């Protein structure tokens, strides 16, 4: 689909209210083409229309959109156009989409303003109660170890920072089985000990505010006395049941740049659908997301796993502002994937048919994710602006 | 100096311990050239050496550095090389530097761990007392309005967010006085109301931790019912006298990208020197910083103001991890300028001789600063990666 979008024969430019369509056909007029446009406010459709394409080969057609309805709610307005072929051809069905493009329109930042959670202090854990719910923070590990909705535990594995991915074929960087590229990203990550790095708890305290509870943690990841990453976190659990998570990550400049900076947990839930506001229905990465579109997407959970024959990191969706899985909701500005296979099982399994679904749902939420490359697959091919080289990283997430 | 660095006739590459020098002379051997190298750990010199250059025209010389001393103190090791001409020529004195380059070496992230400040609540202000010191937060404006060291006030103007700069000639985008470019950055900033935008206080509360005090603020900047920017802040005043400031800024995607995202205040101090760990002795911008070097720099305060004949934003230093001015210290990862002229007076004064020094010191500390452009001066010339287009911005600062 990335190939389809980049190779599309119509190119689009949005002046202000005008869409300029350019034909990259050399010989045919656009005689089987219908432009559909839609304006949505973070997934919700506000306006839509249809305009027949009437563009010569290598020519341009100006399409003036009507007066768009400047809404009242906060959020980002998005314009999406798609060229549909209303007639079947010898090679395509009626209604075939041949080209599309999306733009941000006007944005309206929200300035609207929003019991009290109870903090139990044991020597081994911090427990925060609000209503039926509980949050449990292991004071020895420093991680949120368990969550309670009603009577039922929500996690099978604690919420923990993750800096690695199960390596893609581009990460592995081999074209002949007998020759290993020592500059390959997986060779550099393994030699740096990214997959072996142990978290050293630096700080984990709890403070009761007059409207919430604040858990502060700091961890250092180390391999052989070298600190690779430091993760500083604050968890703000308010009376409205939200858990605001702020993460500041420092990466040593001399370590190879990590594949991702995010969080990972094994949810106890196995739900059927994934619902979320972000880029594209399909899998998209920071290096490959131009074909994706921002919208509200809703797919079965099997659709969020790409069954590459050699298993690797897969199924990521970027630009996500909201993710819904069962009763849980995560908001912010993140990338995610979600599936029944941990990154460890993906990395250790040579064939997709040897994968087995693990008992809950593995959730990877990334503030930051490296590009996937692909200029070739036998040398480092992620461009320098798609590498996580900034050294300090910040992201915020809200879970309910 | 940026022109001197980019045009230098020796080019450098650091493999691992080896410096490869490439000559861009066509006709002369490097017969008046001495490479000086120095390794420092955040300004402090650890090792240094001298190596005569012996490179043919268009040739290469490999220089293997000795065993560098792997230090114990946290911080970033930096390698700086400079080519000096030991002999005078007809056009240069003895000791003339003709070329230089700096690299990051190994980094060691710090994982070391560090009374109680008293919070007065009035209806108009929050006041935090610790020792001799006081911090005052205007509850109606939401800003830190005054600071006390001993008996003496430290601010003449409250610490406030700043999203504008006094426009450069490239921002103004005019080459003929009769013709105004409506796409010029200053025209877009003025039409969007960046210079007129009024801060609307959303939130300002205070919470007393068991080791510090936390002031939380949120502001919205608006022009004619459009929210341009939202600034969310936390001020953490601990028992060690530090004030940790965290700022998260949201920018509306439909406003023109702001010239800077930072803080600005008028310090009551007028001190003689500026001392700081960051890029270059000279003024450097995100678009123009390759000639600068990371080191500890110490200049008179007049050296931090560039007296451009048409006054504009000037004197910024990027990549700064620590800034010292009188008894104050700011740490983090910021850009700053410091001078006796506010951005307003710089913007309103047509000639440098019409500037008058204001009573204290104007401090601008930027998390983020736009590039200055200069491909031409009569059209928009800041490249897209040097524009503040990310929409959400985070920076942290510590004032001590």
| Cα separation values, A79 from A36, A65, A277, B241, B305, Å | 11, 10, 15, 50, 46
Give which of A164, A153, A144, A107 is closest to A321, Cα–Cα.
A107
Phi, psi of A177 (to 5 degrees): -60, -25
This structure's resolution (Å) is 1.4
| Residue A115 per-residue DSSP state | -
Q: Are A98 and A85 in contact (CB under 8 A)?
A: yes
Q: Determine how many CB atoms are found less than 10 A away from the CB of residue A183.
A: 11
B394: nearest CA in chain A? A394
Return the SS3 of B396: strand
Give which of A287, A297, A285, A253 is closest to A393, Cα–Cα.
A253
B254: nearest CA in chain A? A106
| Residue A256 per-residue DSSP state | P
* Nearest CA distance, A74 vs chain B (angstrom): 10
* Nearest CA distance, B362 vs chain A (angstrom): 28
A76: nearest CA in chain B? B253
**Contacts of B354 by beta carbon, 8 Å cutoff, 6+ apart:** none
CB within 8 Å: A107 and B254: yes
**Contacts of B364 by beta carbon, 8 Å cutoff, 6+ apart:** B162, B260, B262, B263, B264, B316, B336, B337, B338, B343
For tokens 């017969």, the residue is B31
Question: Out of B111, B230, B254, whose CB is closest to A202?
Answer: B111
Q: Which two tokens stand for residue B285?
A: 């911008």
* Nearest CA distance, A15 vs chain B (angstrom): 13
Question: Out of B107, B333, B394, whose CB is closest to A253?
Answer: B107
Instruction: Find the distance separating the first CA and the last CA of chain A, reported in whole Å.
Output: 33
CB within 8 Å: B248 and A396: yes
Spatial separation of the C-alpha atoms in residues A13 and A26, rounded to whole Å: 19
| Residue A380 per-residue DSSP state | -
Question: Out of B106, B254, B333, whose CB is closest to A392?
Answer: B333
A interface with B, Cβ–Cβ < 8 A, is 76, 104-109, 111, 113, 200, 202-203, 207, 209-210, 214, 220, 227, 230, 248, 250, 252-254, 333, 385, 392, 394, 396
CB pairs under 8 A between A and B: 57
Spatial separation of the C-alpha atoms in residues A33 and A37, rounded to whole Å: 13
Spatial separation of the C-alpha atoms in residues B367 and B363, rounded to whole Å: 13
| Cα separation values, A102 from A109, A140, A361, B303, Å | 20, 47, 32, 48
Mutate to test the interface with A, among B109, B113, B114, B220 (most CBs of A within 10 A): B109
**Contacts of B141 by beta carbon, 8 Å cutoff, 6+ apart:** B158, B199, B201
| Residue A285 per-residue DSSP state | B
Q: Which two tokens stand for residue B30?
A: 């490097």
Bridge partner list, B208: B213
B390: nearest CA in chain A? A333
A205: nearest CA in chain B? B210
Question: Out of A105, A214, A252, whose CB is closest to B107?
Answer: A252
Return the SS3 of A119: strand
The helix (run of H) or strand (run of E) holding residue A344 is helix A343-348
* Nearest CA distance, B273 vs chain A (angstrom): 30
- Chain B hits for A202, CB-CB cut-off 8 Å, are 111, 113
In DSSP notation, A261-282 reads EEEEEEES---SEEEEEEE-SS
Spatial separation of the C-alpha atoms in residues A38 and A75, rounded to whole Å: 16
For tokens 């900047």, the residue is B221
Spatial separation of the C-alpha atoms in residues B35 and B26, rounded to whole Å: 19
Burial A92-128 (b: 16+ CB within 10 A, else e): eeeeeebbbbbeebbbbbebeeeeebebeeeeebbbb
Question: Out of B105, B250, B396, whose CB is closest to A109?
Answer: B250
A112: nearest CA in chain B? B202
Question: Out of A76, A202, A396, whose CB is closest to B253?
Answer: A76
Instruction: Find the distance separating the first CA and the last CA of chain B, reported in whole Å.
Output: 33
Q: Which two tokens stand for residue A391?
A: 């050294």
* Backbone gaps in chain B, preceding residues (C–N over 2.5 A): 114
Spatial separation of the C-alpha atoms in residues A117 and A138, rounded to whole Å: 18
Q: Determine how many CB atoms are found less than 10 A away from the CB of residue B265.
A: 23
Spatial separation of the C-alpha atoms in residues A116 and A87, rounded to whole Å: 61
Give which of A114, A10, A13 is closest to A53, Cα–Cα.
A10
- Strands B144-149 and B133-138, sheet pairing: antiparallel
- Chain B hits for A207, CB-CB cut-off 8 Å, are 207, 209-210
The helix (run of H) or strand (run of E) holding residue A238 is strand A227-238
Q: Are A97 and A112 in contact (CB under 8 A)?
A: no
Residue A148 among known ligand-binding residues? no
Spatial separation of the C-alpha atoms in residues B273 and A35, rounded to whole Å: 64
Q: Which two tokens stand for residue A395?
A: 């992201």
Burial of A383 (0-12, 13-18, 19+ CB in 10 A): exposed
Q: Are A396 and A332 in contact (CB under 8 A)?
A: yes
In DSSP notation, B284-337 reads -BTTB-TT--EEEEEEEGGGGS---SS--S---EEEEEEEEETTEEEEEEEEEE
Q: Are B314 and B308 in contact (CB under 8 A)?
A: yes
Spatial separation of the C-alpha atoms in residues A381 and A387, rounded to whole Å: 10
- Strands A273-279 and A260-267, sheet pairing: unpaired
Q: Which two tokens stand for residue A384?
A: 């320098």
Return the SS3 of A252: coil
Spatial separation of the C-alpha atoms in residues A2 and A13, rounded to whole Å: 19
């Amino acid at each position: 689909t990335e190939a389809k979008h980049q190779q599309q024969f119509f190119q689009f430019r949005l002046s202000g209210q005008t869409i300029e369509v350019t034909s990259e056909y050399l010989f045919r007029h656009s005689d089987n083409e219908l432009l559909h446009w839609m304006v949505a406010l973070d997934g919700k459709p506000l306006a839509s229309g249809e305009v027949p394409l009437d563009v010569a080969p290598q020519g341009k057609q100006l399409i003036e959109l009507p007066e768009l309805p400047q809404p009242e709610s906060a959020g980002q307005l998005w314009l999406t156009v798609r060229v549909v072929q209303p007639n079947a051809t010898a090679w395509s069905e009626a209604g075939h989409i041949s080209a599309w493009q999306q733009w941000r329109l006007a944005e309206n930042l929200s300035v609207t303003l929003p019991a009290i959670p109870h903090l139990t202090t044991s020597e081994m854990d911090f427990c925060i109660e609000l209503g039926n719910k509980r949050w449990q923070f292991n004071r020895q590990s420093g991680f949120l170890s368990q969550m309670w909705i009603g009577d039922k535990k929500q996690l099978l594995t604690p919420l923990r920072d993750q800096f690695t991915r199960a390596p893609l074929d581009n990460d592995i960087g081999v074209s002949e089985a007998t020759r290993i590229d020592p500059n390959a990203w997986v060779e550099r990550w393994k030699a740096a000990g990214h997959y072996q790095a142990e978290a050293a708890l630096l700080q984990c305290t709890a403070d009761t505010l007059a409207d919430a509870v604040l858990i502060t943690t700091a961890h250092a990841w180390q391999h052989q006395g070298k600190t690779l990453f430091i993760s500083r976190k604050t968890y703000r659990i308010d009376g409205s049941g939200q858990m605001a998570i702020t993460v500041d990550v420092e990466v040593a400049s001399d370590t190879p740049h990590p594949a991702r900076i995010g969080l990972n947990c094994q949810l106890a839930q196995v739900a059927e659908r994934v619902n979320w506001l972000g880029l594209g229905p399909q899998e998209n990465y920071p290096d490959r997301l131009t074909a994706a579109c921002f919208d509200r997407w809703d797919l079965p959970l099997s659709d969020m796993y790409t069954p590459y024959v050699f298993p690797s990191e897969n199924g990521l969706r970027c630009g996500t502002r909201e993710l819904n899985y069962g009763p849980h909701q995560w908001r912010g500005d993140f990338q995610f994937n979600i599936s029944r296979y941990s990154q460890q099982q993906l990395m250790e399994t040579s064939h997709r048919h040897l994968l087995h679904a693990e008992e809950g749902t593995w959730l990877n939420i990334d503030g930051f994710h490296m590009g996937i490359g692909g200029d070739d697959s036998w040398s480092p091919s992620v461009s320098a602006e798609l590498q996580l080289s900034a050294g300090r990283y910040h992201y915020q997430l809200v879970w309910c």
